[PDB]
Amino acid sequence: MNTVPFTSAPIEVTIGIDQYSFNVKENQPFHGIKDIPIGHVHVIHFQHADNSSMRYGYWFDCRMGNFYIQYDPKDGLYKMMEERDGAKFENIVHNFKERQMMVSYPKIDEDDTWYNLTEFVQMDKIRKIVRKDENQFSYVDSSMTTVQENELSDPAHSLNYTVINFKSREAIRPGHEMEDFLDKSYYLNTVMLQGIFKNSSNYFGELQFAFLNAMFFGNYGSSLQWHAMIELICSSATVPKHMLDKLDEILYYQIKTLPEQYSDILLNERVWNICLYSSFQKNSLHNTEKIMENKYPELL
Amino acid sequence: GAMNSSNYAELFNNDIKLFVDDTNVYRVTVHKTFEGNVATKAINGCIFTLNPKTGHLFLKIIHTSVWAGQKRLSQLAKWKTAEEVSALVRSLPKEEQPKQIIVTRKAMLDPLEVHMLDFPNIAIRPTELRLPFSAAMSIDKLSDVVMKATEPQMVLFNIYDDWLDRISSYTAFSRLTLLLRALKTNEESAKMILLSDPTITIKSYHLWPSFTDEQWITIESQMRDLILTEYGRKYNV
Numbered sequence: 001m002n003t004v005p006f007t008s009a010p011i012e013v014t015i016g017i018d019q020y021s022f023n024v025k026e027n028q029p030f031h032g033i034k035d036i037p038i039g040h041v042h043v044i045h046f047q048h049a050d051n052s053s054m055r056y057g058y059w060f061d062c063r064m065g066n067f068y069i070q071y072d073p074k075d076g077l078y079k080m081m082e083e084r085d086g087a088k089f090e091n092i093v094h095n096f097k098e099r100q101m102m103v104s105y106p107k108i109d110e111d112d113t114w115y116n117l118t119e120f121v122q123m124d125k126i127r128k129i130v131r132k133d134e135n136q137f138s139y140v141d142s143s144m145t146t147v148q149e150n151e152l153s154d155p156a157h158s159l160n161y162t163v164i165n166f167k168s169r170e171a172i173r174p175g176h177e178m179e180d181f182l183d184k185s186y187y188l189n190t191v192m193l194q195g196i197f198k199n200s201s202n203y204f205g206e207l208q209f210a211f212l213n214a215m216f217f218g219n220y221g222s223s224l225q226w227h228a229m230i231e232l233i234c235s236s237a238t239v240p241k242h243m244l245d246k247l248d249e250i251l252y253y254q255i256k257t258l259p260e261q262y263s264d265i266l267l268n269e270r271v272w273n274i275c276l277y278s279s280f281q282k283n284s285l286h287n288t289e290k291i292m293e294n295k296y297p298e299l300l
Numbered sequence: 301g302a303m304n305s306s307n308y309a310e311l312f313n314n315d316i317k318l319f320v321d322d323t324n325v326y327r328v329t330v331h332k333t334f335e336g337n338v339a340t341k342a343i344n345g346c347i348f349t350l351n352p353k354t355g356h357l358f359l360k361i362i363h364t365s366v367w368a369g370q371k372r373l374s375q376l377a378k379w380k381t382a383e384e385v386s387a388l389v390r391s392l393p394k395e396e397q398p399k400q401i402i403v404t405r406k407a408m409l410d411p412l413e414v415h416m417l418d419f420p421n422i423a424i425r426p427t428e429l430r431l432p433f434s435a436a437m438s439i440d441k442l443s444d445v446v447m448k449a450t451e452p453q454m455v456l457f458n459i460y461d462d463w464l465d466r467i468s469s470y471t472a473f474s475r476l477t478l479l480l481r482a483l484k485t486n487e488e489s490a491k492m493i494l495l496s497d498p499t500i501t502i503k504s505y506h507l508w509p510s511f512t513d514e515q516w517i518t519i520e521s522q523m524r525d526l527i528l529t530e531y532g533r534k535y536n537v
């Protein structure tokens with residue numbers, strides 16, 4: 001297990017860790033989060049009590065360094081930082097643990113939710129989407145735009161998701177205009193999988209990362225990317241069986257975790273109805289179709 | 301974006317534009333089979349591509365062989381249309397290529413957009429105008445060349461004959477759409493109006509009769525009467 005200590009909590013804030021949320025009061029004796037499962041990426045996230053504007057947070061992996069959180073009263077936000085003095089860090093964490101000033105990452109015997117939401121997500125790939133090479137962790141917030149949104153503005157603060165555009169020369173082979181538009185297999189398998197992502201694991205990782213940025217920060221361009229990556233698969237007539245089976249599992253856990261109350265703004269009615277009922281893969285996503293029909297039948 | 305009554309004079313400005321109408325590309329007769337099932341037989345069709353400013357009609361004849369062994373022909377027909385318009389554009393000198401292409405049916409937008417990706421500066425637009433270009437096959441000389449084609453062929457016409465010597469393109473388009481609307485509403489009567497006077501003929505190099513200005517005013521009123529007549533017969537008014 002690993003630990004993300006907090007220097008202090010000077011402003012009242014709702015703190016997220018992965019799929020959990022908890023409240024810290026202004027100047028409450030809070031010094032961090034312990035028992036964080038090694039082996040996964042994690043996200044620690046924030047929504048200030050006095051200005052819900054800007055959810056923000058940090059993607060990190062405890063295997064890569066010793067990280068802590070410290071409020072900056074000038075920039076007005078909780079910042080992640082790396083402590084290079086490993087003995088200083090271990091000494092700090094131990095004191096805070098001895099004084100029980102840390103909330104424990106829950107350990108649940110019957111739940112594998114976070115694994116199932118981050119199975120293909122790697123810190124190395126997050127750091128290529130979120131470019132800030134001098135840190136081992138990655139800052140994301142509500143307002144950050146994607147490279148694709150920026151083509152239709154600060155390049156340093158952008159989400160560099162892979163651009164997917166169905167009416168683009170990359171998507172459509174000269175002389176196969178009808179074929180490629182109505183059956184996106186070429187774009188999926190040759191352009192994206194073989195060409196850009198190299199394998200389906202990297203494709204799923206970006207899809208999963210996009211969903212989590214949509215859900216945890218309300219990041220609109222992230223929701224657009226997540227739906228585009230689903231639609232590209234569902235709109236391809238030729239998809240390897242293992243990718244369809246895995247996609248069904250990925251989406252099932254994503255729909256399962258979605259706050260019931262946010263489905264109106266996180267789910268695109270057109271994409272979902274197309275994917276489940278009209279697309280080539282309309283009969284290949286049994287688990288996802290079942291949870292969608294029982295959880296959000298209005299959307300359909 | 302879309303073209304409608306608010307931006308109608310744009311049709312006659314000096315930016316090159318084309319209307320594309322696909323309603324006569326895929327044409328069939330429905331009939332009974334010996335077993336008493338139903339089957340279609342395709343007949344030759346045409347793409348109706350029109351410069352409203354100049355009258356230049358690019359009539360791409362769609363021969364029935366293009367459907368042989370193909371499935372989902374009504375969908376294929378939109379893509380074949382976009383394929384042929386894109387080929388036409390590429391065949392034109394740069395300074396003749398359109399700045400906008402207006403499709404008369406919104407189902408032509410994505411096919412044409414996809415085929416024109418190489419031309420990002422050509423706007424592909426719908427329209428809220430209900431244009432009567434389906435009636436193009438009621439013009440005898442166009443119907444003749446389509447039905448006689450034995451192979452794919454492009455034929456060029458001026459659908460305005462020599463009217464632009466005497467009237468503006470706005471007025472010429474107004475006449476053309478009134479004639480086509482009438483041919484669409486009651487073809488027999490419209491042709492009777494157009495051809496009831498043997499002394500007014502259609503020149504070999506023309507599509508419509510050689511009416512004087514005063515005779516066009518008469519013809520144009522008879523066409524409006526017919527459209528109003530049929531409107532009464534239709535709704536019992």
Ligand SMILES: O=C1CN(C(=O)C2CCCC2)CCN1
Binds near residue numbers: 020104
């Ligand atoms: O992060 C935490 C942990 N908590 C839990 O474990 C509650 C929430 C769902 C599981 C029971 C709430 C306190 N904060």
